[PDB]
Ligand binder design. Structure first.
Ligand SMILES: O=C[C@H](O)COP(=O)(O)O
Ligand SMILES: [Mg+2]
Length: 290
């Protein structure tokens, strides 16, 4: 079966003996890539991560999430030092930490643009689906089934605040947890309204994330590779979503998981197993020989 293979754009399996780059570091999206559909790290994945640590391969999270919500989802692995959060690429790069927890990227959203996005979202009535991200906390204006759905997966609850409090907050992104029935339209509105102002990404299901226009996960990738004197040619990125496109296309070695869209897969060098098929275990096998 093809359940566990990694293939190039011609459908040919990638073989270790044909590689000419040692992979020293792997950057991976969390939900939809490392985590299976149940938001868990599979045992096969965990077993391969243990071996990657024994061999000195670095595994770095690159996510739209804050580090706080990551810790709530995979904390048990973090506590056992099996997955490191530092260094890490959070909020789609806008908050990227080195191993000392210093922000090597800190891309706050301009406050005029914040308020314009806010007023626009109230105008088109998606403000109720908004989760605003400060450095250390998230905020929403009300709770509904869509906010509920976001809390369940994110596993970290926003504080509920009044509308007029937003002006005082220093934010890095906003995430709209949208009903499925208005995703496609709302995405068109935001992209038309804020082109060359803000990144707009459909990252996961009906999530729409807006963050610093000149920042993405790949900017974080470059910073962390730089920190450890690792050429980009010895890095590998894997992902599934729109917010992974820049890091998949920016590295010579990248893997789009099988569950990714055709757009995301096209941006990647290789296509691997789905997130439910232990994608990073097979990546580690193919590229690092376990
Ligand atoms: O809520 C989860 C995120 O939208 C997906 O996270 P990721 O960037 O690690 O795939
Ligand atoms: Mg993802």
């Amino acid at each position: 079966h093809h359940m566990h293979e990694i293939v190039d754009k011609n459908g040919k399996k990638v073989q270790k003996n044909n590689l000419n780059d040692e992979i020293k570091i792997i950057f991976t999206a969390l939900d939809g890539t490392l985590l299976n559909s149940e938001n868990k790290v599979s045992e096969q994945n965990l077993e391969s991560l243990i071996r990657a640590q024994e061999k000195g391969i670095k595994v770095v999270i690159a996510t739209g999430r804050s580090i706080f919500s990551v810790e709530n989802v995979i904390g048990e692995h973090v506590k056992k030092n099996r997955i490191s959060l530092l260094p890490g690429i959070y909020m789609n790069g806008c908050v990227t930490f080195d191993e000392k927890g210093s922000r090597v990227i800190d891309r706050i959203m301009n406050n005029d643009l914040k308020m314009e996005i806010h007023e626009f979202s109230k105008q088109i009535n998606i403000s109720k689906y908004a989760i605003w991200f400060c450095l250390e906390k998230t905020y929403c204006f009300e709770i509904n089934d869509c906010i509920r759905e976001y809390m369940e997966v994110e596993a970290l609850n926003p504080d509920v605040i009044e509308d007029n409090m937003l002006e005082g907050l220093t934010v890095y992104k906003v995430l709209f947890s949208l009903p499925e029935n208005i995703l496609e339209n709302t995405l068109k509105l935001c992209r038309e309204k804020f082109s060359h102002r803000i990144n707009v990404a459909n990252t996961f299901q009906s999530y729409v994330e807006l963050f610093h226009q000149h920042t993405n996960k790949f900017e974080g990738v470059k910073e962390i590779c730089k920190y450890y004197n690792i050429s980009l040619n010895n890095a590998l990125a894997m992902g599934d979503g729109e917010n992974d496109i820049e890091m998949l296309s920016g590295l010579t070695h990248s893997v789009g998981v099988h569950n990714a869209s055709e757009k995301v897969k096209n941006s990647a060098a290789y296509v691997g197993p789905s997130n439910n098929e232990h994608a990073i275990s097979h990546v580690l096998k193919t590229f690092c020989d376990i």
